[model samples]
Target chain A: ELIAVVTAITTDEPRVMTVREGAALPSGPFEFGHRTLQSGLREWIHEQTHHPVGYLEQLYTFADRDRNNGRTISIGYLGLVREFWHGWYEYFPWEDHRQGRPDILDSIIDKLRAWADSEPDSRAQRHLRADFTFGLDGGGWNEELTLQRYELLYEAGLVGEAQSEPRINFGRPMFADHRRILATGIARLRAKIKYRPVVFELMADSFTLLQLQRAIEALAGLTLHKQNFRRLIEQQQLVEETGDMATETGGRPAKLFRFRQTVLDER
Target chain B: AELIAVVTAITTDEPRVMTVREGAALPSGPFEFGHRTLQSGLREWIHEQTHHPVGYLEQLYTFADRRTISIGYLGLVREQFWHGWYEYFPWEDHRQGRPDILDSIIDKLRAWADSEPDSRAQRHLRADFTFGLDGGGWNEELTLQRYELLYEAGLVGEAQSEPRINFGRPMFADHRRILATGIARLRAKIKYRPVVFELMADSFTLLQLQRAIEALAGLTLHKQNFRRLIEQQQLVEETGDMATETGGRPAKLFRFRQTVLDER
Candidate 1:
């Protein structure tokens, strides 16, 4: 099977296109006629959403045995679109830190603590994992731990995908590991934007510095220092002015810039 | 059908790749029914061909073409049935300066790009940026892109349509391409990881560590900056001994910090 996380940016908020009415990611089986795995994913995605994928990457391949089926190999891909319009936070409410720590994390930590206290034999180990992954009790928040956070929740019977007796569902669930695949794609992008120029794929051909910053903030789920971010962008020379200006900043006209074409292949 | 292939490298005197069939291809084989995992199957094939046990191995990439699925692995070893990687990619080495062969390779690539009328401009742009002719500077980590472009331009034997190009030694099937992928992975990995030590002795002088890294990187690093970096990262600790095998004054020995594994 092949799966993809088709992501897009809207109003400076990152979103993912979902199938089955915002439940599962776009996926399909490998067909004999496909020339390669990438092409196969592209064909499946186009058929499903009729959207073009700008930047694509292979995320990971898993062949783990599943509960309901025989062992199957699934290749996951991360695709940037330039969406069905569900905010990623709809599925992972706690991941958003743009407003200075979501209030849902308090309930999440309470449930996790209760789960940890319930198990005597594995109590300490479970607490350690929960604290580190969820940034509880002095642990600093690590935005790149999206998948780890989801897996921890699954293990603690907090997510809908887990087989919990009480069924303490924290976030929207997807069909059979589909949410986990989405988390993997999220973590990959949050980490990649630091080193790669992929965020531009989700931006317009020309954008203001603040617009670009907001796009990155949407993906990272964190606000960045404006002056420092612009300084870094300028130093890297990843973007160039488009000889145009944006007058809709609600203030002074901001400079419009485009991604440096040469930097795409240079790196 | 699935196949497992390995590009094991050792940096003894220079970066070397472990190959089979007398240095033409990477050690590889078809996945067997008895093999339980892809890594185990890869280890089995490498040990069978070269009798060298893989020490540090990681999945490099997975490629699917038609009905075949090829899983590639990168392995670093202390020793190997080795052939210098430069023998396969002569233009990659830039220790002293840029290799002269790159000029001819670029000319051939240009001709190939010009031969195509419709996509000639796009192809030329790719060649320029990938080859660092666009003034973006040489990006050593683009080894795979460079190889793929050469193959696409019919400047490499793996293109299968031609055998006349001698730009670099070719491997069976896509083995050369896999090697390029491995090389690119290593070049990128060494910057943030201490993997270069996996190809080093238990204890060595600072220069030895630098040489090992320089070998894999295919570039010369300033002695002072390299030493400063190793010290700054605290990746190594003193072995409480000194090397006496060199011609100059003996330098203090250092070993990879075992504690850094958990710390990292």
Candidate 2:
């Protein structure tokens, strides 16, 4: 009945974070006491970070028993926040992918593909390996397959923690599979914002189109076609001009727009 | 993450039935354990009871408690079968439309609404469930809500503390709940899916289609507009057959085109 998101904000290597000393998702229960689920998430995240979150939305509900103690269900959520580079920088220094090529992605994919190819008995296993690792047969690189990527690497013993003779240290671990759950939340949110008007959760009251697109690109970990994304936004009637301009940018002043609330009423 | 349904079977009423049981419930059980997921559980139940396989199943809603324990699912069944238990509880069959028994139930509901304290929630509940007040249209999708309201009023046998009032045959245990669940699911589904075709014969007139919908929804629709909507949705095909001389102008017979099943 309720929807929410859990976002991990990091600057460097630690791609995922651990909550409650690495034992839980960075989430609280949805209360009818709260005005809405979105607000409840905002309150919870702000309480934890003491820093306002940029964007957030309900990802998907986690129902599988194997993920938890096989009792209660957790509605996993994902959001993206910026500026978390104080004490945790040394724990995960290689996760930042903004500088063109990140060694983590290539290394993990290579090992995953090798593991897939080495499995001789199961054809389904071979197919899954190629599909997840190589993005074979025109399957484009999916940035949202964070959990699958992590699990594949873990299964293949590619990460330093998984290997007896390690090649590279992947990152710090979280308690009780919190990292995997976090990855699930991330993947769900990343895929959802593509079609839903959820990216506004990350935007300021008034923002330049470039700023909005950059925030989305940062969270999704993939760049979108600039013109296409803008056109899509306009066609959906998801945004409206705020009658203000942002002049601080080094280029020409850009118009500011806020997300239109009426889009939720349409199909 | 999973879809589920709670299906029920009910018997209709007949003439010479006086002071009959208002609501004699039916048999219902949860769809769980034996299947991989909820949908399969529903299929397993339907086959076990009716001995007839059900082809189409749609998700109603995922109802969960605070603990996240899912409490079964509700589903619908469409095939035709003889109501052998019709003699037991003889008040449910309203196929004739505007049955006298309905007037009695409505009156009982109005009386119950009057007895309640004047509050916004109570007033809104009475108006919304019984009849749409202030030009607000009556929604058939609120079937479960209306039924529960009637139950609370003790107008139906299922609601009576001592089992006195009997308007419709009830289901065993939560069978009425299951029936309500199915009714709600069907009412909502007809708007999106081409499910009305299941109740039809090989060919039928547009009026027949409208009647079938009204029967399930418990409300009327615009006649010509309904036909237009049906045709525009490409749900049926003209059979080139006409049934004439039935006290009115000849009406066209159309067969449901099955290929559009996957169109949605």
TM match of model 2 to true structure: 0.49
List model 2 lDDT by residue over B113-190, tens digit each: 677567534545565544443235556576666666666667665564564776665654444544565666666777
Candidate 1: list runs displaced more than 4 Å.
A103-139, A147-170, A195-198, A242-252, A260-267, B1-3, B29-51, B116-121, B132-136
Accuracy of chain B in candidate 1 (TM-score):
0.92
What is the RMSD, in Å, between candidate 2 and the native fold over all Cα?
10.4
Report the number of backbone clashes for model 2: 29
lDDT of 1 by residue, B163-232 (tens): 5886878887788888898889889988666555667778888777777788888888898988778778
Task: Give model 1's docking category.
Answer: acceptable
TM-scores of chain A, one for each prediction: 0.94, 0.66
TM-score for candidate 1, please give it.
Answer: 0.86
lDDT value, residue B117 of candidate 2? 67
Give one digit per residue, the lDDT tens place, for model 1 in A102-130.
99999999998888889798786677787
Best by DockQ, which number?
1
